[PDB]
Amino acid sequence: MPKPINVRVTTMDAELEFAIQPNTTGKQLFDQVVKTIGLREVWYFGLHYVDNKGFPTWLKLDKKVSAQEVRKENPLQFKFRAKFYPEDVAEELIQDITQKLFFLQVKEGILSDEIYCPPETAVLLGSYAVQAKFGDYNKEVHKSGYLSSERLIPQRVMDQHKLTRDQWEDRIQVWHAEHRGMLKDNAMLEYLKIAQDLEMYGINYFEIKNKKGTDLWLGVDALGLNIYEKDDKLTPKIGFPWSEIRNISFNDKKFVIKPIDKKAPDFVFYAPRLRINKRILQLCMGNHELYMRRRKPKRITEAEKNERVQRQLLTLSSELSQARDENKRTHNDIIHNENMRQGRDKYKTLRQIRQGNTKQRIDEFEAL
């Protein structure tokens, strides 16, 4: 008689605990999870685990779960998370639940400083998250200190302003009040629309090298491939949109990305670890396929589309200037500020690094 296998699956805000069988496939486990939570925009999501050798792995839906060398423990431990992001959160997400799971996952990344976020944006996001959780601010319900348990902003932002925790709470409350009338779901959407303009939003970074051995980063996202220099993960230097990419493959350490324009050269780079390379391939093909499906069945910021949000950000800029402690800036702070001083942003930079033909950009790449 087959022995049942106890599993535990967590989403950003729930846990599921049930038993599967030795013949249960990843797809069957995945389907049980999404059905339980009522999630139907399944193309964005996957189950993540650690294998019996210590490596973070995404579950294959085709294979038996018992055959994927999941770390032996009772219960087996999985995390249900977004593996891919939409190109534009505003145009694409359909369900409340889908929006929520993205909102929670992105917010976790911002708060942990996995995703760099400048002070004024961080604070405004914080106030939108507060609107989402609490609903309309009401002085007679939300007495002083209602925010005392909240993770409002990244520690870095707190470290560089001469404000107390109580002052941070006072300031976030004022902005919370500004969002009166906004449905919780739309506050979650507004949060995502703001966050999606961040330099590091939605990007998976991988250590790579060009031919002459220069250490670089590869960025894989819904829009395409970016190349970063070793000490600057905010500012891509060279870019290849998915529209120019025919296929992606690798062998051992060598990645070959072929062009749609057959007369263009191949984009070639190196990455040292087999397991990581399998993941890079999956992320590339996955993002590429979604990209193509959107088109064959000029990007601006949320601030630029949304005059009110634009004013809110600049009002916060003025409000935070006095309290700023200029000796507390981090490396990423410094990079971001210099980009801003030059008038740059995510989309301007993306268009800039994508100019020139494929060969010119590959030649730049090999020169780094």
Swiss-Prot record:
GO terms for biological process: actin cytoskeleton organization; actin filament bundle assembly; astral microtubule organization; cellular response to cAMP; cortical microtubule organization; establishment of centrosome localization; establishment of endothelial barrier; establishment or maintenance of apical/basal cell polarity. Keywords: Acetylation, Cell membrane, Cell projection, Cell shape, Coiled coil, Cytoplasm, Cytoskeleton, Membrane, Phosphoprotein, S-nitrosylation. Residues 322-346 have a biased composition (Basic and acidic residues). The modification Phosphoserine is found at residue 317. Gene3D superfamilies: 1.20.5.450, 1.20.80.10, 6.10.360.10, Phosphatidylinositol 3-kinase Catalytic Subunit, Chain A, domain 1, Pleckstrin-homology domain (PH domain)/Phosphotyrosine-binding domain (PTB). Phosphorylated by tyrosine-protein kinases. Phosphorylation by ROCK2 suppresses the head-to-tail association of the N-terminal and C-terminal halves resulting in an opened conformation which is capable of actin and membrane-binding. It is found in: Apical cell membrane; Cell projection; Cell projection, Microvillus membrane; Cell projection, Ruffle membrane. Residues 298-346 are annotated as: Disordered. The keyword Protein transport does not apply. A motif ([IL]-x-C-x-x-[DE] motif) lies at residues 115-120. The modification N6-acetyllysine is found at residue 60. PANTHER family: MERLIN/MOESIN/EZRIN/RADIXIN (PTHR23281). Probably involved in connections of major cytoskeletal structures to the plasma membrane. In epithelial cells, required for the formation of microvilli and membrane ruffles on the apical pole. Along with PLEKHG6, required for normal macropinocytosis. This is Ezrin. The gene is EZR.
